[PDB]
Amino acid sequence: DDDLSARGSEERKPPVVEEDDVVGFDEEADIVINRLLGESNHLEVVPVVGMPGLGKTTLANKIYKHPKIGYEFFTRIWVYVSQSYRRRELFLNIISKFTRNTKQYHGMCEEDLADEIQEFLGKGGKYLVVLDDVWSDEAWERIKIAFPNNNKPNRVLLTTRDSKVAKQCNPIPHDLKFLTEDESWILLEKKVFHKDKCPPELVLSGKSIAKKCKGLPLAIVVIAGALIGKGKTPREWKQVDDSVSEHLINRDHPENCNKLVQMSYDRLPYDLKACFLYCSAFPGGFQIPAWKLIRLWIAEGFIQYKGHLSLECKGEDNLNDLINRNLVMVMERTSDGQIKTCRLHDMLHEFCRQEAMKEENLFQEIKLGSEQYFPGKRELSTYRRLCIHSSVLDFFSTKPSAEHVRSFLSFSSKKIEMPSADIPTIPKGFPLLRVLDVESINFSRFSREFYQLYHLRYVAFSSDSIKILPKLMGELWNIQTIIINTQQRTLDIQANIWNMERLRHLHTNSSAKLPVPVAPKNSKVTLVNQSLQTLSTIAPESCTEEVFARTPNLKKLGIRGKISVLLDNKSAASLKNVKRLEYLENLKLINDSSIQTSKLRLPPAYIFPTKLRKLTLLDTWLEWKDMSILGQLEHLEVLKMKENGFSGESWESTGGFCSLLVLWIERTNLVSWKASADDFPRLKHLVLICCDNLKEVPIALADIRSFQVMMLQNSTKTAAISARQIQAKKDNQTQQGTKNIAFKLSIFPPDL
Amino acid sequence: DDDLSARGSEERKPPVVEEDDVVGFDEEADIVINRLLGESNHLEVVPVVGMPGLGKTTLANKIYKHPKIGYEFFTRIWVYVSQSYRRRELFLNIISKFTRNTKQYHGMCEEDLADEIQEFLGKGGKYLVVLDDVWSDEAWERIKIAFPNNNKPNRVLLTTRDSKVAKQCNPIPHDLKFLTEDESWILLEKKVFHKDKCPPELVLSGKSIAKKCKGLPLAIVVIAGALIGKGKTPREWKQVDDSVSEHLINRDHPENCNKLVQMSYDRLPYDLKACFLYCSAFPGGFQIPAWKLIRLWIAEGFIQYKGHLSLECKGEDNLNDLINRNLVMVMERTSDGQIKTCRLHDMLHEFCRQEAMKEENLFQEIKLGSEQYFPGKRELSTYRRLCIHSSVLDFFSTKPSAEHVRSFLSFSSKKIEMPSADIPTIPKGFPLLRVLDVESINFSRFSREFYQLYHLRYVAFSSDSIKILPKLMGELWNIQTIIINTQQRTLDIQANIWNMERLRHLHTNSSAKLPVPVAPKNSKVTLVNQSLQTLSTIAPESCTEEVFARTPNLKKLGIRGKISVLLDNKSAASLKNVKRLEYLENLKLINDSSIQTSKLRLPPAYIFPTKLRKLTLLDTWLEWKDMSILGQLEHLEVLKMKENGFSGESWESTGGFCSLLVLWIERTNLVSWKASADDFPRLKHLVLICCDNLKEVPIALADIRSFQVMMLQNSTKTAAISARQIQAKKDNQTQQGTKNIAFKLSIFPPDL
C-alpha cells in the first residue's frame, strides 16, 4: 500500500581523473615549504596536526609531488606508517625502493638493515621523507634510526592527529585551517557539478549545506556524493538541507561524520550496499587489488548476472560507481587508465566494520588483546564468515571447529608457513567453505580433506614446493576462480580443466602444461566452456589448436617458456592458432631461458587476433625491424617491452601505430631512435626506464596532440635534454592558442 | 692478611626420604577431610588461602594421599595450575590419566576434549580433584568446564594465595593457620638433626630461632638448611639467631623471606652457587629432569674435575647436597631410590632468578609484554646466555644477532616446528655456542652452517623426519653429550663415533646402527675413548666384539631391535660379547618384533657381567625356568619385566635371588606362582601393573622382613584378596613388634 522512490535507473559514467587540484590547500603548502631547508646540514621534522578527515595527507602528497621539492632533493621516499605498522617490513620496503637485488638484505637484522638505508640515502645528497599517520612518540623514535644526518640538509614531513605527539616532535606544531564558507561552496559545487556551474535555484540550498559542514573537506565530499546520488530538484535539495542542518549542529564531535556517512550509505542500492561493506573485511589501510576484490565479489554471490553485461565488467562498473560516490579512494591507476588499487578512508573503514560486524552480521574478525583469549566453539558457530589478519598459526593450534563458517580470509603482511601437523585444521574445521584466500599462507602440501570441500567457489593459495596438481584437484565443480603462486619453474596440471563447468578464470605465475583436451569416447557432451576468460601463463607446447578450440571467449592470453617453439616454422602453426581466439585483447609473452640460442622473428600481423589492445613482451630479444608488424595491428593501444624486449641499436619508426596511446620501453640497448609525428598520432603516455644506451628522442614527438605525460628514468643526459626541448616546444604550442591537453614531464633523477 | 672460615671439607651424605610426616598440620587435614561428603550429589570447591610458603601445598598433598580419601573416591587427579597454565595441555593430561592411547584426542577441540573427561568421570563415580596455585577467577571458571556436575558427590580442592579468588570460588574459604612456637621448634629440630636428637647446648638457640620464624614453615626450613650448612656449634647457632632477628623485624613484607634465603645462599660454597642459580634458568614451576640438569652442569663447566669421582657422580652429589639443604624440593624418586625430578620453590626461584639476572649476569630471560618489543642488537650483545620459553618463532623471525651468546636453551611442554626459512637463523647467530637444547624445537633438516659450529659442548634436539646422520656431524670435536629423539624407526649413524674423543654419553630413542669401528691405518693412536659411559639404544647388529672393545667404561647398555639375532648362539656371539664389560650396572633389552618366530632362550649365567644391578626386559618372552639363571646372578638388586618380558602360565620359585631389593612385573600372563620366604630374602618394593590373569600372590613373600611397600594396579580381585592377606600378615608383624618398617598396601582401584 506504501511505496517510495519509484523511478527508473540511468547510466553511471566512467571515473576519469578530476579535481586533481586541491582547493585552497596551496597556502599551507607554501608556508610548510618555507620551513623546508630552514637550517642546512641537519635533520629535522615538520609536524602537521589536525583532526581526522581534515586534509593532512592531501597536503603531504601535494608537497611531495611539488616541482621545487623534486628539484631540491634527489632522493624522496613516501612511507605509510599505520597504527599497527611493522618496522622490519618498513625497512625492507625502504631498502627495496633504492636497491635492485632482494637476496642480500633478507638475511640481515633490522639494525644492519638500517645501516644500508643510511648509506644509500646519505650518498646522493639532500633527501626528503614523508611519514603518514604516526600515532605515538615511540613509533617515530624507533623509525628514525634509519634516517642519517650526512652534513647536508635533509628533511622529513610527518602527519599526525594528536597534539601531544606533535609537541614532542617539535616545540611548535603546524595546525591546519578549516575552509572558509566561500571555499566550502566552491569545493562543493566543483565536486557535485564537475565542470558545469550550479543551477541558480540549487545555489541557495548548496550554500547553506556547504556552510553547515563547517569547512571540514571530508564532510563536503560525502555530502556531495549523497547529493549526486539523490538527483537535482529544489525539493530534494531542501530535503538534504534540513537533515544536514541536524547532523552539523555540532561540527567538531567525531561521531557526526559517521552519521553523515550513514546518510550516504542509506541511498546506496542494495546490491552496492554489500559490496561497500565487504571492502572493509580487509585490514585498515590495506591496498586492495582491484581484480581480486571483484573476483571475491562474484564468488560471494554479491554480484548477480542480469542479461548480457558480464559479471566482471559489471563489477568493475560497481567499483567505478563506488569511487564516484567518493566512498572509495583510488590509490593507483594502470597505463590503460583503469583502476589498479583502492582503499577506504579511516572513518569510513570504522563505520563499515562496525555495521558489518554488528547490524548485518556479514562477517567477523578475531582480534585479540593480550589478556583476551581466542573464542570457543559455541560463539564461532554463529559466525558466517571469518577474517584473521593477526596471528593465525596460534589460532589454528587451538584446533578450532565451526560448521556454519563459509569463508576464510587472511591478508597477512608476512608469508607464514603452515606446520605439517596443522594442515588438516582448515578443512575439518570448515567443511562448508565457499571462499578460501590463503595466499599469505604457504602450504607444503594438501591433506586429503582439501578434496572434499565441495562448496568451494574461489581459491587462492601459495606453495613453494608444489610441482604437480593431482587429478583429484579437478573433482570440485563449484570453483569459479583459481589463482596459484609457486616458486617452482614448471607446473604440471593433471586435473582436467575442460570438464570443470564453473571456472571463469585461471591465473598462475609458473608455466602450465595443460593435459591434452580429449572428448570422451562414450559422451555426447563436448567440453567447451563459455565461462573461461584467461589462461595467464600456458606453456608454449600447450598452444595446440585443440586447446584453443576449447576456449571460445578468452579475453586475454599469456605464454611463458620458450617462444622459439611457436615462432619456429615446424610449430609456427602453434602461434598461428592464436588467430582462432576472436575475443583476445591482452597478450603477454614472457621468456625464461637466459641463453640467446637463436634469433626470433614474428610471423605476419594477420595472425594476431583483431581486437588485441594490450601487448607485453619480456626478454624476447626481438629485432627492432619487426616493430612494423606490431604497428600493423589496428586496435592495439598499450605496448610494453621489459628486460630487453627488443634487441638492437638503431630503430626507425615506420608508422602503423594508428590507435596507440602508451609506449613502455624498459632495459633495452637502443642507441638511435628515428620517427616522425605520423608514426604515433594518438600516443598519450611515454615511459622509458633504464635506457642507459640511447643517444636521442625524436623531436617529432613534440608535435603530437594526444602526447600528455612523459617520464624518463635512469636515462642518458642527451635524452633528458631532448625531453626538455620537447617540453618547451609543447609549451609553445599550448601558448599559441591550440586546444592542446596539458603537458607534464618527469625525470626520475632530476639532474639528468 | 685477613682470612675467615678456615676449616676442612667433610662428607655430605645421601638425601633419603625423611620427615615424611608434617608437623602440626593434621588438624587442617582432618578439617578438610571433614568437608568430605558435605552434601551428596553436587559439585563444590574447598578453597585454601594463605601467604606463600605457609604449607597449603603440603596440606593438600597430605589430604590427597589420606587413606579415607582414597577409599571414598576411586578416581583422584592431581593438577598443577601455575600463573602460566594453558587449558589444552591440562585436558590431555587429565585424559592420559584414564586411557593408555590418546591419539584420537589430539585432533579434537578443547570443548570435546572436556566432554571426554566428563564421560570418563561419569564412569568413575565419586571423584575428588585438586587444583594448585589458582591466581585468577577466570582461570577457575575456564578450567571448571571439564568437571561434570552429573549429580554425584564429587569435590574440588583448590589452593590459592589470594583471598578474592577463594571467596568467589566458595563463600567460605579455609584460612590456613600459622605454626605454633612448639611446633616451630619441633619442625626445626626435625629438619636439622633428621632422626638424631638436638644436642642440649644448642636447644635454647634453636628455640629462639624458631620463635623468630613466626610459624612460617618455609622460613624454618631454609634456616635449618643454613644451620646444616654452617655446622653444629653454639657459635654458629648464635650467629644465625642474631642474623635472623636482624632480618625478620617485619611480618607482612614478602621480601623478608627473600632476605632469609640470601642468608642461606651466601654460606653455600662457590661451586654450588653457580648450580643453585642455574637451576632457575628453567621456567618457573618446571619439572627438571635430573640427568638433563646434571649433564647441563657438566657441559657449562660448573662441575670441574676434582678428585677421582666421575663428573656425573659429582653432579649427582651436588644435587643431593642442594636437596639436603632444602633449597631444592624432590618431586619424584626412582624405583631404586635415586632422585628423578626436582624443582625450586616459588619464592626461592624468584630470589635466584633476580640474583642471576641482575647481580651475577649469569643469564637473561626474554619475556615480553604485549606493548613491549624484543630487545635490540646492542642489548643482546652484552648477554652471555639466553633462555626463551615464550614464543620463540616470533623472536627468530626478527633475525637476531649476538656474537657473545654462549648458550641457547628453550624449555617447554609443547614442541614447535621450525620453518625452513628460519632454520639458518640459529647457526648464524651463535657461531660461539657452547651448549644447545632445542628439544622442544623440531628440525626437518639442518643448514650446512650448523655442522661447522665447533664451540658446542652439549646438543639436544628433536627431529621427526631424520633418518640419516651425515658424516659432517662427526666433525665437531668439543661436544661431550648428545641426546637425540626421532620418530623414525631406524637411525643410521655415519659420523665416526670413535674418532670423537670428547663425548661422554650418547642417548637415543630409536635403533642406531653404529658405523663399524675401523682403526686408522696410518695413526699410532687407538680410537678408544675412556669417557663414553653408555649407548642407550643401539641396534642388535651393532653388537660386536670390536665395538665393545672400543668402549671399556660403559655402566649402561641398551639394545633395540631383533633380540633373536643376538640370542641365538649359532650366528655371531653378541650376547657372549656383552660379557666383555668390566662394570655394567644397567642393561636394557627391548624387542621390536611382535611375533615369536623363534623361541628365545637365555644364555648361561657366566655370560652376564658380575655387577649387573638393574635389568629391564621388554617383549623378550623368555621362559620362567630361565629365572634360575637370573637367580644365579649374585649382585642383582633391581629387576623389571614389562610387556610380557617373561611369559608363561606357571612359575615355580627356584630361589637364589639373595640380594634382590625390588621386583617389578608388568604385563605378564602368569596365573600361578609358588614361592618360599627364603627365595627372596631382601625384597623391599613389589610392583604389579595390568596383570588381569594371575590367580594369587604368594603368602611366603609376607615373611620377607625388608618387604615394605607393595602396589597393585588393574589386577584381579582374587589377586587383591591375596595381597590383602599379605597386608594382614604385615599388620600382624606390626602387632608383634618386629623391627621391620611398617607396611602399606596401595591399590589403584580400592574396590579390588
Ligand SMILES: O=P(O)(O)O[C@H]1[C@@H](OP(=O)(O)O)[C@@H](OP(=O)(O)O)[C@@H](OP(=O)(O)O)[C@@H](OP(=O)(O)O)[C@@H]1OP(=O)(O)O
Ligand atoms: O593485466 P595487465 O593488463 O597485463 O596489467 C599488468 C598486471 O597488472 P594488472 O592486472 O593489475 O593490470 C601485472 O600483474 P599480473 O597480470 O601478473 O597479475 C602487473 O605486474 P606483473 O606483470 O609483474 O605481473 C603489471 O604491472 P607492472 O608493469 O608494474 O609489472 C601490469 O599492470 P600495469 O599495466 O598497471 O603495469
Ligand SMILES: O=P(O)(O)O[C@H]1[C@H](OP(=O)(O)O)[C@H](OP(=O)(O)O)[C@@H](OP(=O)(O)O)[C@@H](OP(=O)(O)O)[C@H]1OP(=O)(O)O
Ligand atoms: O633414568 P630414569 O630416570 O631412572 O628412568 C628410568 C629409565 O632409565 P634407567 O633404566 O637408567 O633407570 C628410563 O629412562 P631413560 O633410560 O630414557 O633415561 C625410562 O624408561 P623409558 O625411557 O623406556 O620410557 C623410565 O621409565 P618409567 O619412568 O616410565 O618407568 C625409568 O623410570 P624409573 O626410574 O622409575 O625406572
Ligand SMILES: Nc1ncnc2c1ncn2[C@@H]1O[C@H](COP(=O)(O)OP(=O)(O)O)[C@@H](O)[C@H]1O
Ligand atoms: N581541499 C580539498 N579539495 C578536494 N578534496 C579534498 C580536500 N581536502 C580533502 N579532500 C578529500 O577529503 C578526503 C579526506 O581527506 P584526507 O586527505 O584523508 O585528510 P586526512 O588524512 O587529514 O583525513 C580525501 O579523500 C580527499 O580527496
Ligand SMILES: Nc1ncnc2c1ncn2[C@@H]1O[C@H](COP(=O)(O)OP(=O)(O)O)[C@@H](O)[C@H]1O
Ligand atoms: N608442617 C609443615 N608445613 C609446611 N611445610 C613444611 C612442613 N614440614 C616441612 N615442610 C616443608 O615445606 C616445603 C613445601 O611446603 P611450602 O612450600 O613451605 O608450603 P606451600 O607449598 O603450601 O606454600 C617442603 O620442602 C617441606 O620440607
